[PDB]
Amino acid sequence: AKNLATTDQSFSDDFNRSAMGGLWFLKSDTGTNQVGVSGGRAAFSGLTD
Amino acid sequence: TAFVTFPEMFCDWGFALGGTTGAQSTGTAHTHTLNTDGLAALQIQILPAGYAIGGYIGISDTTIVDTIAMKMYKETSSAINNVYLEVFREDSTGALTSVGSVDVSGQLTTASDYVEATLPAGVIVNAGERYVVRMRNATTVGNRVGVSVMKELVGGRELSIRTETATDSNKTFYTPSEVLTAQGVSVIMPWAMMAAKNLATTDQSFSDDFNRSAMGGLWFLKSDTGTNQVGVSGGRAAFSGLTDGNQNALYIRPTAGDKQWVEATLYETGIAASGAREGLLMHANRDLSQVVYLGVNLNTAKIYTGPWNSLTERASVSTTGNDVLWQMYFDPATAAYTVLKNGQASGLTWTDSGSVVAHGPNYRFGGLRISRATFFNAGRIDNWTLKDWA
Amino acid sequence: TAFVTFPEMFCDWGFALGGTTGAQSTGTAHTHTLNTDGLAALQIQILPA
Amino acid sequence: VGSVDVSGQLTTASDYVEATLPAGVIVNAGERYVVRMRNATTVGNRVGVSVMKELVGGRELSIRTETATDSNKTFYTPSEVLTAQGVSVIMPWAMMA
Structure with missing residues (x-):
């Protein structure tokens, strides 16, 4: 989940x-x-x- | 409630070996049969004065830390002092900032036993950040300290720090360059714990x-x-x-x-x-x-x-x-x-x-x-x- | 945040061996002594197209 | 807080044995539970259990009793628990689902 909002x-x-x-x-x-x-x-x- | 660099069950236990070995260095060719007498577990690393070793700790759920623990002992029964366990928070840039330290030389024992020490004050931690539990061992008498570690394999990520100079051991605010150098130099990975013994x-x-x-x-x-x-x-x-x-x-x-x-x-x-x-x-x-x-x-x-x-x-x-x-x-x-x-x-x-x-x-x-x-x-x-x- | 088939600490590290082996296949009967020179970790599997 | 007989479904091959409790038992985070295998058989055939070796110098958290009375005990005392922990040399694999 490297990048999340x-x-x-x-x-x-x-x-x-x-x-x-x-x-x-x-x-x-x-x-x-x-x-x-x-x-x-x-x-x-x-x-x- | 606590956070460990790798599960405590490895320090407490071990694996039984099995199978068969390979060729020999010299002599008649033969392969020995493995059995339960072979144990796979953590190793022990001796360390002299002025040498500091630490490992990165992940934070799963945010809480307040109260104590830190490490598995170590002393080689000889001679009197020891100036053995410090400290905690460093890793910032966004990767620099390590000291947020607590404690002297553990008094309660050390010759036998390999856990060392748990209370921080001077609570240090709030949050999920997603990384922390390092460093053992300093800047003693004066000269008795070495043996810490239970587990061997790391090359080709993977490096997330343990190790310093040899007395100046670096006494350092309280590591720069990113020094952190990278320590990560490159380090060859072992110690067992460290940050606990939540008592909560309101x-x-x-x-x-x-x-x-x-x-x-x-x-x-x-x-x-x-x-x-x-x-x-x-x-x-x-x-x-x-x-x-x-x-x-x-x-x-x-x-x-x-x-x-x-x-x-x-x-x-x-x-x-x-x-x-x-x-x-x-x-x-x-x-x-x-x-x-x-x-x-x-x-x-x-x-x-x-x-x-x-x-x-x-x-x-x-x-x-x-x-x-x-x-x-x-x-x-x-x-x-x-x-x-x-x-x-x-x-x-x-x-x-x-x-x-x-x-x-x-x-x-x-x-x-x-x-x-x-x-x-x-x-x-x-x-x-x-x-x-x-x- | 991630999910892994087994903890990455195994993929990154290993265990030091200890103890003593058993009997040999042939020759003089003896048992070797394990030490930290033996590493227990995952293996590598080669695979063709 | 729960017992089950698993002699019928046992197999000679090393396979997992899963048994349903007579009734649900509520559990809470922070408490500890022990899964005890008794083996008070009458025929006399032994049972092999998959365990993982423990290393000295660490915490003792497995129990092992030898006498038939101790095996048939239902409400242990702290002294007997400490004695069993000291005696035990192996640690078994147990699951509560």
């Missing part, structure tokens, strides 16, 4: 699940807490600055 | 509108009728056939954890005659050894436990107008099951004080159940859904 990939996430999941590489300056999903919305986990 | 597992959820022609391969069907199973008609599941008995459909795809939430709408259940039991199944074994079942008739709704052959009633409640979108879920914080009718509490709750229900990897399957008796099929079901509520 490549489509334009598109993705969407409602963030309406329990955990962040493996579909998101997380990197934070806190050290332990990353972007956490709560109440169906992403937010800053932890009380750190 | 999601809460898997599934749903089916039951709006197709056949039952489909996404449902394991088991019934006491013998021949007929849950059949889809008019876009709704139903008890196929005129026989008296029970039918169950189990979703092939399991959920993530013990937290379960199943929901479906009950249709044509207010016209039932007597004893028509149908509804949803949660915490179902693959072999249906023990299940938690929600049975709704035209009069009431009950919760059942146990194998499909014989069910035990745990709780019951008398309701009316049972043609709505029923839901029922399990909270492991209190180990309790709660049923919500049309978004209302409906006062249906069971508490497992005795822990009669076992929760584990083999008890995360849901499904649907119908029963038919006395020439009156139970209601039909639609909009089936299972998920892991937060």
Whole structure:
């Protein structure tokens, strides 16, 4: 399949699940807490600055 | 989930030889008979300090890498250090860029054993790109390192890199010219692995509108009728056939954890005659050894436990107008099951004080159940859904 | 993306032999020792028009 | 989770033997399954199985039991599984379709 008519990939996430999941590489300056999903919305986990 | 330069089964196993050899170099002409005592497998390549060897790794499905592995050992028992395993991404131009490295000299063993090392941070990979797992071995003491490789045959594609100078071994950003030179120089091909040991597992959820022609391969069907199973008609599941008995459909795809939430709408259940039991199944074994079942008739709704052959009633409640979108879920914080009718509490709750229900990897399957008796099929079901509520 | 009758890694590479052969056809009875000099790989078939 | 008798359809020539399970068994990605050949015959004729030799120093993932009780076992324990893995020296070819 040497050459294909490549489509334009598109993705969407409602963030309406329990955990962040493996579909998101997380990197934070806190050290332990990353972007956490709560109440169906992403937010800053932890009380750190 | 991982990617290997060539299947690990070759490193783990070998082929038995057979047949007959050919002519001799000198002496009386004879041909020896091959047998199982001859083994075809990977070879071992010793390598001195300052010599780096690596192989290209394909990416099948995109994910996040966490660790890398190689099959190697040390020749002598002397102390060693400065043994590095690193990962290089190949750009469009073919240049190699370092995206991670790790010291593995501490955990090395004299015996030929796997070496698995965690990267400092995750490196996202995508299907279609190529990666190289390089072993550096820039030690100071001088003990050599033996890596398990498999011999390459000339005349084919060259996709292994090998560098001898200490400068090239310590290089962290190879240019295309140096990559081509290393590919030309290289004669072996090492065994390398890029793994996905730990992932942030999601809460898997599934749903089916039951709006197709056949039952489909996404449902394991088991019934006491013998021949007929849950059949889809008019876009709704139903008890196929005129026989008296029970039918169950189990979703092939399991959920993530013990937290379960199943929901479906009950249709044509207010016209039932007597004893028509149908509804949803949660915490179902693959072999249906023990299940938690929600049975709704035209009069009431009950919760059942146990194998499909014989069910035990745990709780019951008398309701009316049972043609709505029923839901029922399990909270492991209190180990309790709660049923919500049309978004209302409906006062249906069971508490497992005795822990009669076992929760584990083999008890995360849901499904649907119908029963038919006395020439009156139970209601039909639609909009089936299972998920892991937060 | 492609489909192959058997993995191309065999077509590109080979295996190193090891072990020991069996009895000989004639002469003094002996068994040779296998080493990395023996290569196990696919063969080449000639074919006329 | 499933057993089948394949003595009737066996042939002296080395040929594939395919047997249907009594009922379907759902499987999921990430789990592991073992296809065990028992051979608890009464006449005493031996059975030859096509295997592929394993090399030492690698992972052990084949099971081999010798005693009749072990062969007739239905629910193995982790200790017995480890002992069988250590004892085994061959790896058989098995398919689940």
